[PDB]
Every structure is written in C-alpha cells, then in structure tokens.
Amino acid sequence: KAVILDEQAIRRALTRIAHEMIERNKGMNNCILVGIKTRGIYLAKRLAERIEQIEGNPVTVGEIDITLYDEPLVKGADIPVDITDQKVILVDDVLYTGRTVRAGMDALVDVGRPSSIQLAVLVDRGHRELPIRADYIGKNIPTSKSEKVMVQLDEVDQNDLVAIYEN
Amino acid sequence: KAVILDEQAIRRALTRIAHEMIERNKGMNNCILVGIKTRGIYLAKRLAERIEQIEGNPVTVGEIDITLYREPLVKGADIPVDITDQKVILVDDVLYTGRTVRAGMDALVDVGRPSSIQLAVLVDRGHRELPIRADYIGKNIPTSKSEKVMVQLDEVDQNDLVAIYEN
C-alpha cells in the first residue's frame, strides 16, 4: 500500500474542481451534481458545499447507488429534482474502465432527460475500456493494469486519502 | 450549404485513421470495426479495406443500424463474429452530441461483451452532451449549435463530401 494523495491534496483537488465547475457552468445555476459509487456521492456533497459557499446558492445533489466493478448494476437512484432539461454532472471517486459511469449515464438517460451530462472525478487512473473521458479531474495517476487505486473519505472511512495497491 | 471536406480530404482522413488504428492496436489483429449509422457502416468498410490492403489480413466489420439522434433507438445489430473478449472500435460519420454512440455502446454491451470499445469518427463537430470522446478523428470542425454537418459517401449518395449548413 502507498499513499498518493493526502487530506490536503484531496482538498486542493476539490477546491480546483468546484472553481472549474463554477467557471465553465455559469456559476452552476441549474446544474445538478449526481454522485455514483459511495465515495462519489460524498464528493458530490463536498463539491456542492464548496460551490454554495462561493455562489450563496445551494447546489442540488443526487445519487445513483451502483455495484461498482459491463457487470455494474444500477440498484436505484435518488435525485430530489426533476432533471429534465437540466445540466447534470456525474461525480466519481476514481475513474478507471468507465463501465460504472456508463451504467450511471444509462440510468440518468432513463430517470430524466437531462440536456447534458458531464463527468468530474477525483482521480483518473487511466485504462478506460469505453470512450468515456472526464471533464474535471482532481489528479491523473499513472497506473499499471494490476494496480488498484482506492479513495478513503472521512465521512465513510477513517481518513481522507487516496492509496494505490499492487497485486 | 458549403463544402468543408472533398473526396480527397475524406480519403486522406481515412488513410490517417487506418494507419492510427494499425499503429495503436498491434496491426488490428483481433479488432472489430463496428459501424453506426448508415455512413458509419460504409466508413467502417472503407477502413477495413484500407487496413487489409496494408496488413494483408482481413478485418471483421459489424454494424448497428440506429437512426441519428433527432433518444436514438437501436433496431438491431449484425456482427458476423462473437465479440466477447474482443476489442471493438465503433465508426461514426459525424460526432456531435454523442447520444447515438451511447445507444450503440449500450447495444454492444448486450450482443457480446467486448474487452473494450473505442470510437473513430470522420468528423467531430463538437457540442457533446455526454462525456464521450473520439479516440480517432479525421477532422475537427468548429461549429455553432445551430449548424448541421452532413457526410455524403458515394455508396449511398451522389459524391464523397462533408458539408455544413446554417439554420
């Protein structure tokens, strides 16, 4: 095991993402953050919080609970608003093959009809297996196929960190 | 109406794509080209032909006939081989919103279970509405939202050309 991002690195990446979201989406007016995977949901909440303290406007947060690693399956969803004709940004903790994002994207296209969907990820470890790319990245991390990258957030786990494992 | 690419421009872009496919996919050994949309199917056949005349090995071509967005409904596929564990490359004529590619991608993850899916497009006009990007592009063409870009191939139309229309 090895730590690649610590709490400070994660906080800086998130502050950078929040700003980029605000800069490229007209202050995030009418944009919905939708987290996928457990930690993606927590990151979406952190981003909404950061954006609100800057915009003075709350940002709607939704979620899709999916079995992560095209086997990943959408067991449900919970988006407090109608997303029809709204810009949605999926928030993922670690972008890898892209297969969870595809399952999450399919669900959104069937829960509502958003005008568009973007992708923000804390870490992109490469090795996609689908033509899906992140629009916002906290940190690109070069990995081999056998490595595993894992994010720990303090509202779920013990600490805020990103670790990489061999095997 | 205005012509942005002529027969020669189309031919050069395709030769460039065929080479990139060969260079990035070990000579295209075991890679399947799958066309989407009428002209995507024809371009896939042209690329398979170019790759064969360079590699001396045939390239399997498949197809998904979906209608271009304005969600795109899949009428069905037709892939002469079992694509399970095989690298697939979708071939599109014009990449725009990405919504036809999404419908085509979903199908592929149901007819078979390819190890990966990449995307080759003759023209990318921008304005995606999904986090889908092309891995091979013949020509990037900057457009406004109201413009329409259309590919014409001689197998189905009068000439080989790409035109742009205002609205």
From Swiss-Prot, chain A:
Enumerate the residues binding substrate.
Answer: 38-39, 92-100, 125, 149
User: In which domain of life is the source organism classified?
Assistant: Bacteria
**Gene3D superfamilies linked to this entry:** 3.40.50.2020
One Pfam family named in its UniProt record: Pribosyltran
Ordered alphabetically, the record's keywords are: Glycosyltransferase, RNA-binding, Transcription, Transcription regulation, Transcription termination, Transferase
- EC number, as in UniProt: 2.4.2.9
Biological processes per GO annotation: DNA-templated transcription termination
**Position of sequence motif PRPP-binding:** 88-100
Q: Which reaction does it catalyse?
A: UMP + diphosphate = 5-phospho-alpha-D-ribose 1-diphosphate + uracil
Protein family according to the UniProt entry:
Belongs to the purine/pyrimidine phosphoribosyltransferase family. PyrR subfamily.
Q: What does this protein do?
A: Regulates transcriptional attenuation of the pyrimidine nucleotide (pyr) operon by binding in a uridine-dependent manner to specific sites on pyr mRNA. This disrupts an antiterminator hairpin in the RNA and favors formation of a downstream transcription terminator, leading to a reduced expression of downstream genes. Also displays a weak uracil phosphoribosyltransferase activity which is not physiologically significant.
Q: What else is known?
A: Mutagenesis studies identified four amino acid residues that seem to be involved directly in binding of the protein to pyr mRNA: Thr-15, His-19, Arg-128 and Arg-133. Arg-24 and Lys-139 were also likely to be involved in RNA-binding, but mutations may have altered their subunit-subunit interactions. Arg-16 was implicated in pyr regulation, but a specific role in RNA-binding could not be demonstrated. UMP and UTP increase the affinity of PyrR for RNA.
Oligomer status and interactors: Homodimer and homohexamer; in equilibrium.
Know the name of this protein? Bifunctional protein PyrR
